[PDB]
Design a protein around this ligand. Structure first.
Ligand SMILES: NC(=O)c1ccc[n+]([C@@H]2O[C@H](COP(=O)([O-])OP(=O)(O)OC[C@H]3O[C@@H](n4cnc5c(N)ncnc54)[C@H](O)[C@@H]3O)[C@@H](O)[C@H]2O)c1
Ligand SMILES: NC(=O)c1ccc[n+]([C@@H]2O[C@H](COP(=O)([O-])OP(=O)(O)OC[C@H]3O[C@@H](n4cnc5c(N)ncnc54)[C@H](O)[C@@H]3O)[C@@H](O)[C@H]2O)c1
Ligand SMILES: NC(=O)c1ccc[n+]([C@@H]2O[C@H](COP(=O)([O-])OP(=O)(O)OC[C@H]3O[C@@H](n4cnc5c(N)ncnc54)[C@H](O)[C@@H]3O)[C@@H](O)[C@H]2O)c1
Ligand SMILES: NC(=O)c1ccc[n+]([C@@H]2O[C@H](COP(=O)([O-])OP(=O)(O)OC[C@H]3O[C@@H](n4cnc5c(N)ncnc54)[C@H](O)[C@@H]3O)[C@@H](O)[C@H]2O)c1
Ligand SMILES: Nc1ccc(Oc2ccc(Cl)cc2O)c(Cl)c1
Ligand SMILES: Nc1ccc(Oc2ccc(Cl)cc2O)c(Cl)c1
Ligand SMILES: Nc1ccc(Oc2ccc(Cl)cc2O)c(Cl)c1
Ligand SMILES: Nc1ccc(Oc2ccc(Cl)cc2O)c(Cl)c1
Lengths: 289, 289, 289, 289
């Protein structure tokens, strides 16, 4: 029994889903951490069967989804939950969605797990460029997209079997300036890649757990489409399929099969690394055309 | 008349001072941005003559200090100033110390300038390791040590002559895990090096201004001694003078002479770069001993 | 069925062997390309069933060696073998061992294969430190460790089905200086990784073939003892096992299971990358002690 | 007085010349090491006062060429010149042009100098793309562009006072693939930068001598047109001037004033570094358009 917690999903159009699918080929149970705001709306789509076709894992199998619970990366413990969300229309019919509350939840219901996934981000001012991003907008970006990874590791390590494995998703915007990826998402990802190394030493020396991050390429997910900058996301994909070393179309399951491998023991000697699953676009410099 | 604003100084034991000295050899006027909490205490040391010896620039000259004004990197505009600092014992006898307020101040009193320096940092939980750092502690670190650089550029660009030059100071802790540099200072510096590139494109494309950051090595400054981790700082220096390619002792004026050059036109073609002034320690891998 | 040519094995103590072992678990047909100097002696020990307990794959499997051929990566085509080597005591008996003749031989007896492994290096002056390496040895190191790959790629890409994968081994000493790794080796690995980028480009766009390189930690191989500097390899294994995030002995099969992943469809979205398999050593700057 | 040997100048259109120009502003004595093929013709144009308007240093100065010697970096010592080149039409007249003989010659007529500039490269197959480069040309490229430095360093370090500085030129195509930069050049620059690290180590610890390398943007030099791919160099200059953060034509003197800084005490704390002087192109991933 392998339980993998995938924190960061909304539909079946993102990386978490592509991550979950590939893992199922290994028959790992899947628990989904969903942002409260789209939880029920997600749960609803689930109950009606909108994901049934999207769940038929290759190897003639259904995607064994252990559970799907509310989860919010910008809240550590139950007392960080302010009066606002306390009232916020949706949050009302939901509870125990703070990072530590889900850890306790999953650990009480199913116990120790051995694979953790951080597939979530958000930069409220992504549309403004760094130079025009506020302190609130930026720090919020880091809090949601960077620190969470740390917070998650702090509370979840406790319920993880020895030698578990953690992964996150990052963007090359962090190493080379890619115009239009603003509001702190560059700063954020830059830090998330650095903290990967630092956490890699702590988690590995003390608990002997590994942690790495995947630097994916363009993907038409709700977040990517929601960016808005014929859309930032549509421009990155066009460019990629045209200039990337590998001419084919990048699939979520592409990052999924890589995540699958990095979350296994077949990679026991790899940690604190940033693995590029971007068809090789990251190696290029000046485009031919 | 070259006016350089150096934001981040407390005594004459840090990099800003080593920065200012080297610049004076070029007869550039110096304006000091000082943290309110140590402003007057700094001003006092200044009036008594505790810095007179520390100001005798090589080339038989005094260090022409245009001014020294209160400055706080964790406050952008005058309205971000909360009721706390509003009351805080010290702040009381000080005003116009928000990033935009000093910009306006310096611009009204002396006008356009052409060299900007970001020599300041602070991580309230530096003593805890990443995995044990809070959200407050971390984000505060980023706000003080990372976003400020951006905020500073946003407000100061306006009063800068065409083709000005900006620099900041960063630490290799950002690229390779160096135990004991916690509380977010690794995450912080990682982002400050990334945002350097992104700001490098904006500032350079739009205003034709350059920005780079210096990756210094160990220096026994109040901040370094204040870290506490025979002290983190004493261990880094011992190690460096023993294994670094260049066997000599690293001086603030070392980073100073490099800052001097990067803040000039003699480097007009360099931007968005992280220059290591660490005697080469950063090139090593495994130490001989 | 997947066929893999491992150009490197010269006994079970290095990565060459480990890689082979692991590829077998996945049931791929191997084909060793042994170097003439050690070809006679290897077959010998193979017949005497010495490697028998070494061809032990946990899953009560027995390695599946398909063919075993003499192979010297110094020669591109049969016209490059000189007279002396042509008439050497160890070579006389053997034949068709050039990079072109083994490629045809392989394509003749089995057809197109779809996995190329490069696990070889040589540097006559590995002992002498860079400064005192001769132009002769230097060019010999690259010719042997660097070029050998490029030429394997040119000639072997014509017997490789689309989507087939290639890989090679490298050492961090190219990115970070490790005293003692001389004779032009650091230089050679610096080229192999850059070349891995350029090649991943041409091979991608043209043949839909991927190429990557694994940066392995230390393993006591025949070749590692050759390095004389408890020698160099024993200091490296000791330093590593005490300072890497993961404190477990780095097995050769660990690099093996990673070569296997790269060599398969699982990694179809990765090319031109230097993936570190080394228990995380590369992410460290300063030590714990 | 500072003496600098610039091994590279073959006419005023490249970085070699620009570097020389700038070093003069600082009043350093230069010494050109011209290649035999172009030695006769260079002296010619020099006597005819053609470079006269080119030796124009803004400050109404007139360049200060000290000596001008034939120099071929292919040969380490006089025993390496072969018979044919020894008897070639362009070489017969000349003498003492090996890396060892020019070093003694320089030390004999002037004594120890304290600034070594390496501004040369060659690759017979720069035109052909990596995959189709021969072992011969490849080894020739490195022997010419890579090794040449290491050997200059060994022999010249004995006529260089402590704290003296060395530098060389490189191109980003080593870190990022730029189609068209072939014949083993990318590979060569990949070695030069790694070697810059190793050398900066041995030279530091031993001779207190620093060594760095400048990664310059595109400049239309004799050698850049040799590259046939508006050719390769004109596409590079055009792409650069339109996408680099700084949109100004990249002068050779800009790389020059940076070589001058590195070559002086100002940078006494920097070694083993690849400093980019290229208007910021290297920090870009995707383009604006
Ligand atoms: N699409 C791409 O081309 C691409 C490329 C490189 C990296 N990535 C990264 O992949 C990861 C997954 O994103 P995706 O693009 O597949 O999109 P996605 O839309 O499926 O996932 C984003 C998720 O972030 C979560 N989120 C935001 N704020 C949160 C909070 N406070 N608490 C909890 N969850 C919160 C949401 O639940 C949402 O499902 C992201 O980190 C993203 O940056 C994506
Ligand atoms: N000492 C080293 O070995 C070393 C190495 C690499 C990088 N650096 C960097 O050099 C820079 C300068 O530090 P230093 O080490 O010379 O020490 P320093 O003690 O002189 O300077 C630190 C300054 O940060 C300022 N600061 C903190 N919070 C602030 C706020 N909210 N608003 C305004 N100012 C604030 C203080 O005024 C203080 O003078 C730092 O960014 C530091 O990280 C130092
Ligand atoms: N052992 C380590 O700690 C370590 C670390 C990093 C990288 N590597 C790399 O691992 C790879 C394999 O080396 P290993 O360390 O396992 O040692 P190894 O001694 O098992 O492998 C080297 C093999 O290459 C063959 N060889 C040498 N020159 C050859 C030529 N011209 N043509 C054909 N074969 C030739 C020899 O038969 C020998 O078996 C190399 O590329 C090496 O650089 C090893
Ligand atoms: N022009 C650019 O855009 C550009 C960009 C990046 C790096 N570089 C580098 O700049 C440096 C100088 O090249 P340049 O582009 O100014 O061209 P250049 O043609 O002026 O310089 C090359 C010079 O080296 C000499 N040369 C060649 N082989 C030699 C040998 N064996 N011994 C002695 N001298 C030899 C020639 O006389 C020639 O003048 C090179 O190292 C090159 O790689 C140039
Ligand atoms: N607010 C926000 C912005 C962008 C996001 O994901 C990404 C989408 C596309 C690309 Cl190219 C890189 C990304 O990191 C996510 Cl998940 C949230
Ligand atoms: N809160 C805090 C912690 C560390 C600081 O400066 C540094 C001191 C020493 C080193 Cl090695 C690297 C640094 O960045 C500064 Cl300036 C503030
Ligand atoms: N002549 C020679 C020298 C060293 C070799 O392999 C290596 C051995 C040990 C390490 Cl640490 C790194 C390596 O690349 C190989 Cl395979 C051949
Ligand atoms: N045979 C040859 C080929 C290219 C050369 O220099 C260069 C010219 C242009 C660019 Cl973009 C990068 C370079 O390194 C030099 Cl100097 C010699």
């Amino acid at each position: 029994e392998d339980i993998c917690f995938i924190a960061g999903i909304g539909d079946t159009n993102g990386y978490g889903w592509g991550i979950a699918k590939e893992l199922s080929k290994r028959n790992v149970k899947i628990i989904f951490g969903i942002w409260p705001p789209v939880y029920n709306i997600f749960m609803k789509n689930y109950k009606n069967g909108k994901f049934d076709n999207d769940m038929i894992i290759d190897k003639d199998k259904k995607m064994n989804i252990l559970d799907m619970l509310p989860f919010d990366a910008s809240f550590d413990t139950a007392n960080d939950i302010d009066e606002e969300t306390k009232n916020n229309k949706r949050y009302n019919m939901l509870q125990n969605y703070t990072i530590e509350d889900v850890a306790n939840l999953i650990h009480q219901k199913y116990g120790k797990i051995n694979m953790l996934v951080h597939s979530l981000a958000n930069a409220k001012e992504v549309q403004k460029d760094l130079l025009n991003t506020s302190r609130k907008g930026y720090l919020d970006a880091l809090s949601k997209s960077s620190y969470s990874l740390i917070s998650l590791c702090k509370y979840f390590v406790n319920i993880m079997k020895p030698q578990s494995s953690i992964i996150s998703l990052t963007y090359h915007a962090s190493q080379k300036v890619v115009p239009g990826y603003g509001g702190g998402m560059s700063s954020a990802k830059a830090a998330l890649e650095s903290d990967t190394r630092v956490l890699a030493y702590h988690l590995g020396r003390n608990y002997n757990i590994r942690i790495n991050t995947i630097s994916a390429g363009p993907l038409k997910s709700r977040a990517a489409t929601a960016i808005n900058k014929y859309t930032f996301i549509d421009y990155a994909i066009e460019y990629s399929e045209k200039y990337a070393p590998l001419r084919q179309k990048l699939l979520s399951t592409d990052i999924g099969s890589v995540a699958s491998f990095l979350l296994s023991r077949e990679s026991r000697a790899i940690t604190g690394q940033t693995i590029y699953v971007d068809n090789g676009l990251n190696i290029m410099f000046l485009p031919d055309d």
